[PDB]
Design a protein around this nucleic acid. Sequence first.
DNA 1: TACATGCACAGGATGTATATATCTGACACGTGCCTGGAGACTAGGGAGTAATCCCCTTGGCGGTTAAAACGCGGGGGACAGCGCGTACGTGCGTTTAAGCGGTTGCTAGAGCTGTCTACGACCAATTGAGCGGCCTCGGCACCGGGATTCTCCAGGGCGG
DNA 2: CCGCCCTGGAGAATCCCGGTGCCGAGGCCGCTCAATTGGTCGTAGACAGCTCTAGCAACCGCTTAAACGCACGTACGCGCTGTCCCCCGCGTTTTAACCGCCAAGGGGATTACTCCCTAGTCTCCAGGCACGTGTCAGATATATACATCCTGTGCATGTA
Lengths: 895, 89, 85, 96, 97, 98, 106, 96, 92
Amino acid sequence: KIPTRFSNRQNKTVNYNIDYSDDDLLEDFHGIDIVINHRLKTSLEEGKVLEKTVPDLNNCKENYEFLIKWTDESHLHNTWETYESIGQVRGLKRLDNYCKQFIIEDQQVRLDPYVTAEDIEIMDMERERRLDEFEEFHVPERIIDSQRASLEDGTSQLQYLVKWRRLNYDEATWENATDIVKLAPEQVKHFQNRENSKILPQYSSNYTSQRPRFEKLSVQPPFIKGGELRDFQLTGINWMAFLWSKGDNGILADEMGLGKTVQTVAFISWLIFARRQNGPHIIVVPLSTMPAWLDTFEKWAPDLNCICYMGNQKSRDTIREYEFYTNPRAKGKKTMKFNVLLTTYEYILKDRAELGSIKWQFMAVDEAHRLKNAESSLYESLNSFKVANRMLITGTPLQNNIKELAALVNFLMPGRFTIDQEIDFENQDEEQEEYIHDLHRRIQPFILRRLKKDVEKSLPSKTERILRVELSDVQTEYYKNILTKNYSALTAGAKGGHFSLLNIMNELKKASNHPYLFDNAEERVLQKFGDGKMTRENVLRGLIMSSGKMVLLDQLLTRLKKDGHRVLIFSQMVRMLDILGDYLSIKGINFQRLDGTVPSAQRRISIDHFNSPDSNDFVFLLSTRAGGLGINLMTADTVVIFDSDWNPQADLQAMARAHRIGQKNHVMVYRLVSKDTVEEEVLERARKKMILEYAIISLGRARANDMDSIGESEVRALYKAILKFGNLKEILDELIADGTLPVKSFEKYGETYDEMMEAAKDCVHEEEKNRKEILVLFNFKGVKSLNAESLLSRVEDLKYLKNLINSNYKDDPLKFSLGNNTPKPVQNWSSNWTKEEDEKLLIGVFKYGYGSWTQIRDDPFLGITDKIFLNESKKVPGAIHLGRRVDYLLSFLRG
Amino acid sequence: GAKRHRKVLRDNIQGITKPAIRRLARRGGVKRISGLIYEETRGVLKVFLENVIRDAVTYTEHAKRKTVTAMDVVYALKRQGRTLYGFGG
Amino acid sequence: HRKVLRDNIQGITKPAIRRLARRGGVKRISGLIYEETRGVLKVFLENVIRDAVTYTEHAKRKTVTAMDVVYALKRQGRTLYGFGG
Amino acid sequence: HRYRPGTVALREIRRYQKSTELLIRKLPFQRLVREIAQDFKTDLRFQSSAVMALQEASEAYLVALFEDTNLAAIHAKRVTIMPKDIQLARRIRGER
Amino acid sequence: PHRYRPGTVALREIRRYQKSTELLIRKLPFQRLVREIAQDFKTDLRFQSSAVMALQEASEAYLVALFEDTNLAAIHAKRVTIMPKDIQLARRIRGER
Amino acid sequence: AKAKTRSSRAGLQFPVGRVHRLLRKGNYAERVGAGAPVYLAAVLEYLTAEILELAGNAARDNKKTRIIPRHLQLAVRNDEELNKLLGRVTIAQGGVLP
Amino acid sequence: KAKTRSSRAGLQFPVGRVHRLLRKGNYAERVGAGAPVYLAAVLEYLTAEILELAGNAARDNKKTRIIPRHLQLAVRNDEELNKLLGRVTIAQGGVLPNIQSVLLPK
Amino acid sequence: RRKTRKESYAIYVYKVLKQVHPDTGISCKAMSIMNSFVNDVFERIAGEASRLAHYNKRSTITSREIQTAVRLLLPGELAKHAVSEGTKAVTKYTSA
Amino acid sequence: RKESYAIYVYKVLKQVHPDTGISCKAMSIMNSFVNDVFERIAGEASRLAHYNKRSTITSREIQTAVRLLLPGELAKHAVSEGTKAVTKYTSA
DNA sequence: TACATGCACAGGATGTATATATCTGACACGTGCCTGGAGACTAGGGAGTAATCCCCTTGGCGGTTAAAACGCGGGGGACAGCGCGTACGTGCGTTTAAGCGGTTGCTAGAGCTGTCTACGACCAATTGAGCGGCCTCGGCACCGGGATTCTCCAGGGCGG
DNA sequence: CCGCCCTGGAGAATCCCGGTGCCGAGGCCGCTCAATTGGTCGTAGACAGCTCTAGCAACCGCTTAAACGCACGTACGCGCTGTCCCCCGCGTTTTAACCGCCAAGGGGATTACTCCCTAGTCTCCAGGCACGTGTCAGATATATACATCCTGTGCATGTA
């Protein structure tokens, strides 16, 4: 640590610190946020005349009123203002930008007679879509937290942190609880259940090194409130439960349309409501499927606390602050409040630190072919997770080679199998067929595959038809010059030598599709066939004739149009789709187009415009790999594979956009191949893969605990329980679920309860003999000071109220009516304590119990949020007074 | 309309955006910048690159290669009095 | 061992500096230019003569030759044609 | 934390003279490099470090040229650099 | 008497000295300067006459090329008179000092 | 006899044998003297130590325990003579002097 | 026999002397047979390039001998010879006549 | 004893001069400048070819290194006419 | 097997700053630096031997090349370092 | 005489800082090998040294005249101040594309091992090309006398 | 009647033509060293085969900050004006650079001879690279003792 070498050079010392401060250069709102919609009249319409022309900006200012979303509000506070009403404030430029396009420009196009009626109706439909979306923001979706804030001299109204339907957690706002219960009481109810819940990660049975023997069953379990669970769906749950009991990890590999999401939701329901494994579970899905997952948990398991973890940095911070742990502010280690977490692949990589440091109990990865590569970032990030059991959901466990399946297995079973060999159909020795038999036998207990034909037989069959069409003259010229690297002929008509021969396979496929994919080919043709063909219909000849595939395609289109068929044309290159979209434009056919540049908003517009009953569209141009697995074009009938793929599953998925559950015609497929080109090397290499997948898959502390010993804390817990619920013999498993009583057998609790009431009855007997001598506490198992008289009288009080409400207003505890005779009022409290307040108090002690006054105060279902002032003007009522008032009102009811 | 024509794309020299040129002027300590500077700067950079690449490609063709490596660039920079440290290994 | 020379930078007179500025194309000259240019010239000459005397000492000679000056110039990026080499 | 008017440029000079990252975006610069190389030979490949070396060198060159341009602007009693300042700095360096 | 206007004789001299090639500094004063600078590096040095002539050719080429850059810097500032700050700017941009 | 390195005989850390081998194979002359690699390795080690001392001081002034290219740039451009020796040189990821 | 390699290449510059200078300048361990011929051809081309322009400049001044002034005029008036010799001083060469337009009388 | 011989390019420069300008002479000082020019260009080309052979781990300087060095050092059209001159000389030499 | 000066640069660092590390990019810069000054010095000593009609590069050539290439005070201390090392190597 | 709200007080439940067992990542220790550096010995040329020659560098002198030094009037250009107008920076809302992660098959190129031949180094004998010495007579420099080209200022004419 | 502009001429400077005479450019010659020829020999580099990784083309998706378009205000650049400082043009005096000649002698170049230092070759081993593993201090979660604090019950005055 002492330097043994210095410089004798006499240079001046330097300060190398480059940290600076900008302090020497020194000396949450309420403005327009969004403009939803406008109105024809700012106040009153003095005349509908002069509808011609388009209004000016000043005219719009003096003629309309707008619905304004305000910053720091919550859409429920949207008001109708005018340019004059609000006047001057932030965000005024947003209002001007609204007037510029939705009023001025929009009316301009509607005045031009060059616009067809079909375009006018499209704009009308679009405006309808915009406002229909803006309606969903009023509906609350989930209540996150509740605080008793104190308004400006407004006592302490209750505020609900509400998240809205189509918004994230950076848009969640506080709202007055009295209005929330009027808007959506079902979500208030769900927040109540989620508040004091039995299903909690801290109270799960730790099945370690020994798991209960699962029994294959044939009854849809009662905790599955969704609907009618299919037979092939019930089979999967038993499969997964068996694999879990043994301690194994499987793969759900059904085909699309069999509901693989329902089966895994119902399995989590089983894993919680049966084996009491309700810890933190994680489900990783693609973004496009996240809606369909969420509502499934909302329908087939409405009691589970499932949260969605996605959004911007602020929105993801809100979730961690309010919905992760039971108590976040505590400095010590925090617990977990949720049961199921739903995230996407993007945030597994962003927040791997905040998510990997959690003891998960079950991981489920949807679309697990995304994990077919063991060197990807998602793979190395999901393996570092500390999870017990795992499951993968994929309709294609193997796609190209056998290394993909090996990586999936090593994700599930890190070390069990050892798939370190690749099948080759060239050697075909007896040992290789043995290898196929070996793997096909070893993985069978871990893959559950079913087909759309083996079940759900109502499905029209699909037939594939390969068509080999030879090249043309321009195609043969280009294929020849590229195959020989003859730069000169390829660059004779080029703009800067743009002809690049890096990746020759790519150029041979561009030539085998259409010569116009190369630059200046349009100049060579047309000019060298019909020089002077600058007019249309003659250019169309250049398109259709310069390609061998264009000929067969044009013939097919003319033939198919007259028959009652619709066409889906798939291609690998989107530039070939531009060429096709020009041939169809000059011809005059109506088509749709979906590729990787079309934003998600326009995609669903296109899909519905194609599936409308009065649809003038004939064909749909589709990129082969775009869109994902959610596109549904079952109205079309014919599928034309223009370009093939190295992966056969990528083309099968393109066929499944018309051959799915719901298809009612015979789907016809047309492959277009160019003979004696590299295209034939693709199909052949694809076929091998199609055979491999049919050969491997498609063949079928510091102190110890105890058991049931009752201690001092156990007696104090049972004493406070006899100070609240009292008769808990029929409610023993409930209090043991939420953690009130320690982990003890219900038998010992019942025994101690009989002993408690007997020691109290003997106490009151001794007190009776000790009160008439000259004319109340008793210790139990160490706990001193236990009121016997008050406890037994309270037991009789609660039992009286139970047999007065469990049979009278059972199916409606809120709808309750006291007797016509009214007891005398209170001793002048700070609130208008009438008879309805007494009835609501009677229901509150029934639902939340005695002593728990903070629970009774915080419940808008009663209506006494601001009528009770236990703690934060010193008010008259209190915790002792409400209890004495119940013992006075109930004694008035008994007689 | 016209979809097969792969044109209407910005030039590659224009990918050196005006904010990027302004950041480079800020690291040089410049306070105000004229509006005509941005087309001037693009012309200067384009000349500079053309002199370095022409040399690197020469070094690449002599070695009978098709790949321009980092050493080709280091040598091309060195032979015009602009030695660069940090890539020569 | 000869005598000591001193104050010889003043033998670069103002007329000679004006002629050098005229060959550079200069039309008007400030009066503060003369001492400034004397300083610039003295720095240039110190660098070249230091390198040339280094070359002379390495060869163990006592006379500075024209090749010593030509090498001293070349190594500073100022090649001179017409004196050999 | 309200800054004075007219101090945005000074704060940016202090910010960018402290950091060391590259100030041009990588993808556009790489497209430019390949377009220029296209005119000397067709079908060239590039190591990724060759493009990184080109970018380091080209940005060092431009920053050092903006320093001389700024000196030429202060000489003319201005604070705004103009194209004539770049031209003067490049002619005195011996490039024009 | 007759007088030429200021700047006429200066342009005449620019044309005279841009046609000639002879050395513009006197030989004997320059030789004394060379020897005085050298005596601060090693004593009792001798010089070939062609060595002093090479030093003078190089010195005059250096100074003429510096006055060209100084004139550009003076015109840049919208002057016609060269000043010490023009020499300083030109030398700073060259990379000397 | 047991072999001692030529760098330890001269009291050096830089490798004298490798510098000798690089002189013999760089076409610098027909012959290489015995003291030429020792002298040259001593000078290379001296210049390395001069730069590393200043660069470690710069890393310490910025509260760091590891030299990065920025610290080399600061050390070189602040020293007058090192700045002269490396005047036409660009250090990658080095920045400028504020 | 006795035939120089210069006459076999059709050159005026000495191929054997260039070969000797390559083998004794420590440029590599070996020297190929066509490297002296190539290098001598290039040096001869460049010499002829500059001498043509210098003789033209000598004719413009009504002279029959080339002096350093004519080599300087030749080099600084040709755009590519000026770039090859950008950092070279030609002794007794002078400069090119060039007055800035701002300095001319109006 | 004996005045040591001194090699120059003067006689070859004189032959080339008589090919280009049959009636023009040259002075002693201009001939010295031409000799310096030839030696300077020789050193440049040969040094760049030496470096090229080192970069590629070769032990020989061939006409390919001379050609590549000529392309690196000469600018523009000078380089094209020089490589054609050199290639023509090597072709005439080899076919003899 | 790239053969660089990394381990020797590290040994020198542990003499000037024992409790300091160095990153990998900085180590590559130091490697480029030592190669650059090696080439400069060896080239200048090569030219010194050619000018004087010598065949050998000796310590005297290295000393003169150091005096020509390093500025001012660096050259004084580098010359004394080299001289000390050759004296120690010989008397051993 | 008896029931009910107001008040003071006692005492354990929950919050907090601290010592302690646990996990972890960089640091130091041990292995191997193998390749390049070190030790040893020899031949032969390159480098060092002494003696000599002769040239070219330094020093002195004396006259001459070109160039520098210096003084002075005055013209013009540097410079400071002022006013205007427009281009540049700032803010704010909206679009766009960069960055990151991913696919699929093919090829370039580095690194390794191994074979083989043409080419370049090396050498001895020869010979002619190029160099140093000598000589001379033409291109070029200098001088002189006109011819002409250019600068500048004052006066007359002409327009406002 | 006034202001400005064109021109005419006077003088200084530059160009041009002829004459002279000089001293270096270019040719000739003898010789002597380096280029050429012819032969041998070893290894550099070209070619082959094989494995492993990056680069490429043309698509896909998602997030987010950067790029961009526009409105607008004011800070700066630029133009004009006046003053006065200082540089130029020119004449008169002073000084020292230059030229030509001479002499001394210092040191660089040449030659002969010697010896020691480096390349070449060969044997042998450990220094440096790649790899794996034991270890210790720092970060961290947790049990624990201590401490502050909200809370619930028995006594008391007031009303029926």
